[PDB]
Every structure is written in structure tokens, then in C-alpha cells.
Amino acid sequence: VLYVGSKTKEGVVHGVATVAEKTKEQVTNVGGAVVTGVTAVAQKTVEGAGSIAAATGFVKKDQ
Amino acid sequence: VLYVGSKTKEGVVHGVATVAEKTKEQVTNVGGAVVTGVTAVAQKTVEGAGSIAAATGFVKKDQ
Amino acid sequence: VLYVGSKTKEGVVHGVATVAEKTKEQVTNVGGAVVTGVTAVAQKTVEGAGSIAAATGFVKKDQ
Amino acid sequence: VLYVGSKTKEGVVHGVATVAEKTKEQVTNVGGAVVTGVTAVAQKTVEGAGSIAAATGFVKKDQ
Amino acid sequence: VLYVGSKTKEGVVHGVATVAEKTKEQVTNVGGAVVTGVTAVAQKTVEGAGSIAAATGFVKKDQ
Amino acid sequence: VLYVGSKTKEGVVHGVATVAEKTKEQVTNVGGAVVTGVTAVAQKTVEGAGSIAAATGFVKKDQ
């Protein structure tokens, strides 16, 4: 009847510092899935599924 | 009856500093899926699914 | 009747510093799934499943 | 006779990421010296003195 | 006669990530010297003195 | 006659990650010297003195 939320924080990222130094970065992909380099990501889902870094090679459900 | 939200934060990213120094970056993809380099991403979904960095190679559901 | 949440924090990442120095980084993928390099990720899900770094090679459910 | 310098680096700063989150920052100074917040500074001096963050309160050398 | 320097690095800072979270930061100075918060600083001096974070209160050398 | 330096590193800082979380930070200085918070600092001096974090209260050399 008096639901009060003052400083609610849900699904939050703050205060991040990153450095990446690479000479060579190489990805070779043949018929699959690759997910690389995911940084500072925030998500909130209500009445649903939540996925952030998902990879699936392949699906074969013929006939 | 008196729902009060003052400073609600849901699905938020703030205060991010990133540096990337690379000499060579190479992606080769043959019939698949690649997702690279996702940074400072925020999402909120209501009554639905939420995905951020998703990759699927291939699907074969013939006939 | 008087639900009060003042500084609720759920699914939060804050205050992160990372350095990555690599000379060579190589990923070779043939018909599978690879997920690498996931950093500073926050998620909150309500009435749903939550996944963050998931990989599935392949699925064969023919006929 | 054949002085060769290929990739000489002297007095160099590179690849820096910083985040500063402050609610209140206050400096009160009465007759002195204050130096605050010096970041990512590079200097090279040849045949001379080099100073970067220096503070001197006061000097009294009367008569 | 054949001085060769290929990848000489002198006075160098690289690959630094810093986060600072403060609610209140206060400096009060009366007739002195204060130096605070010096980060990622590089210096090279040739035939001279080198100082980076120096503070001197006061000097009295009257008459 | 054939001085060769290939990957000489002198006075170098690299690969540093720092986090500082403080609620209250206070400095009060009356007629002296304070040096606080010095991070990731590199210096090389040739034919000279080298100082990095130095503090001197006061000097009285009258007459």
C-alpha cells in the first residue's frame, strides 16, 4: 500500500576501467559460434529469460 | 496505492573507461557466427526475453 | 503494507580495474562454440532463467 | 658515427584508463600551495631540471 | 661507432587501470604545501635533477 | 664500438591495476608538507639526482 523504493539498483555496472594491449588477435570460425570480448554489460528482465554471452555451434533437427 | 520510486536504477551502466591497443585484429568466418567487442551495453525488458551477445552457427531443419 | 527498500543492490558490479597484456591470442573453432573474455557483467532476472556465459557445441535431434 | 635509434621511447605514458567518482571534493587554501589530481603526464628535459608536481608554501627572505 | 638502440624504453609507464570511489575528499591547508593524487607520470631528465611529487612547507631565510 | 641495446627497459612501470574505495579522506596541514596518493610513476635521471615523493616541513636559516 506504501511500497517505497529509494535508491534501488538492480542489474547495474558502474566504475570500471579496463586496458587491453594485444599485438595479434585472430579468430577463425568454420560452421560454429564464437563470442569474445564482452565488457561492462547490464541487463534486467521481468517475466522473461535473460542471457548475455551465449554461443551455440549448430542444430540439426531434420524432417 | 502509493508506489513511490525515487532513484530506481535498473539495467544501467555508468562510469566506464576503456582503452584497446591492437596491432592486428583479424576475423575469418565461414558459415558460422561471430560476435566480438561489445562494451557498455544496458538493456531492460518487460514481459519478454532479453539477450545481448548471442551467436548461433547454423540451423538445418529441412522438410 | 509498508515495504521500504532504501539502498537495495541486487545483481551489481562496481569498482573494477583490469589490465590484459597479450602478445598473441588465437581462437580456432570448427563446428562448436567458444565464449572467451567476459568481464564486469551484471544481470537480474525476475520469473525467468538467467544465464551469462554459456556455450553448447551442437545438437542433433533428427526426425 | 652510425648512431641508430629505431623505436626509442623516453618519457612516455600510454594505455591508461581511469575513473573517478566523488560526491564532494573540497580544497581550502590560506597562504600555501596545493596541487591535486595530476594524471597521464610525460616530460623529457635535456640539460635542465625537470619537475612535475611541486608545491611550496611560502618564502620569506626579507632585506 | 655503431651505437644501436632498437627498443629502448626509459622513463615509461604503460598499461594502467585505476578506479577511485570516494564520498568526501577534503584538503585544508594553512601556510604549507600539499600534493595529492599523482597517477601515471613518466619523466626522463638528462644532465639535470628530476623531481616528481615534492612538497615544501615554508622557508624563512630573512636578512 | 658496437654497443647494442635491443629491449633495454630502465625506469619503467607497466601492467598495474588499482582500486581505491574510501568514504571519507581528510588532510589538515598547518605549516608543514603532505604528499599522499602517488601511483604508477616512473623516472630515469642521467647525471642528476632523482626524487619522487619527498616532503620537507620547513626550513629556518635566518641571517
Swiss-Prot record, chains A, B, C, D, E, F:
Q: Altering Y3F: what's the impact?
A: No effect on osmotic stress-induced phosphorylation
Q: Which residues form the signal peptide?
A: none
Could you tell me where this protein is found in the cell? Cytoplasm; Membrane; Nucleus; Synapse
Question: Per its UniProt entry, which superkingdom is the organism in?
Answer: Eukaryota
The annotated region (4 X 11 AA tandem repeats of [EGS]-K-T-K-[EQ]-[GQ]-V-X(4)) lies at 1-31
The residue intervals holding the sequence repeats read 6-20, 21-31
* Outcome reported for the amino acid change (mutating E21K): Increases oligomerization
In which tissues is this gene expressed? Highly expressed in presynaptic terminals in the central nervous system. Expressed principally in brain.
Residues that bind Cu cation, according to the entry? H14
Q: Which residues carry this modification: Phosphoserine?
A: S51
Post-translational modification note: Phosphorylated, predominantly on serine residues. Phosphorylation by CK1 appears to occur on residues distinct from the residue phosphorylated by other kinases.
Q: Describe its function.
A: Neuronal protein that plays several roles in synaptic activity such as regulation of synaptic vesicle trafficking and subsequent neurotransmitter release. Participates as a monomer in synaptic vesicle exocytosis by enhancing vesicle priming, fusion and dilation of exocytotic fusion pores. Mechanistically, acts by increasing local Ca(2+) release from microdomains which is essential for the enhancement of ATP-induced exocytosis.
Quaternary assembly: Soluble monomer. Homotetramer. A dynamic intracellular population of tetramers and monomers coexists normally and the tetramer plays an essential role in maintaining homeostasis. Interacts with UCHL1. Interacts with phospholipase D and histones. Interacts (via N-terminus) with synphilin-1/SNCAIP; this interaction promotes formation of SNCA inclusions in the cytoplasm. Interacts with CALM1. Interacts with STXBP1; this interaction controls SNCA self-replicating aggregation. Interacts with SNARE components VAMP2 and SNAP25; these interactions allows SNARE complex assembly and integrity.
Family classification: Belongs to the synuclein family.
**Domain topic, free-text comment:** The 'non A-beta component of Alzheimer disease amyloid plaque' domain (NAC domain) is involved in fibrils formation. The middle hydrophobic region forms the core of the filaments. The C-terminus may regulate aggregation and determine the diameter of the filaments.
Q: Which disease is it linked to?
A: Genetic alterations of SNCA resulting in aberrant polymerization into fibrils, are associated with several neurodegenerative diseases (synucleinopathies). SNCA fibrillar aggregates represent the major non A-beta component of Alzheimer disease amyloid plaque, and a major component of Lewy body inclusions. They are also found within Lewy body (LB)-like intraneuronal inclusions, glial inclusions and axonal spheroids in neurodegeneration with brain iron accumulation type 1.
The protein's name in its UniProt record: Alpha-synuclein
**What is the native source organism of this protein?**
Homo sapiens (Human)
Q: Which gene encodes it?
A: SNCA
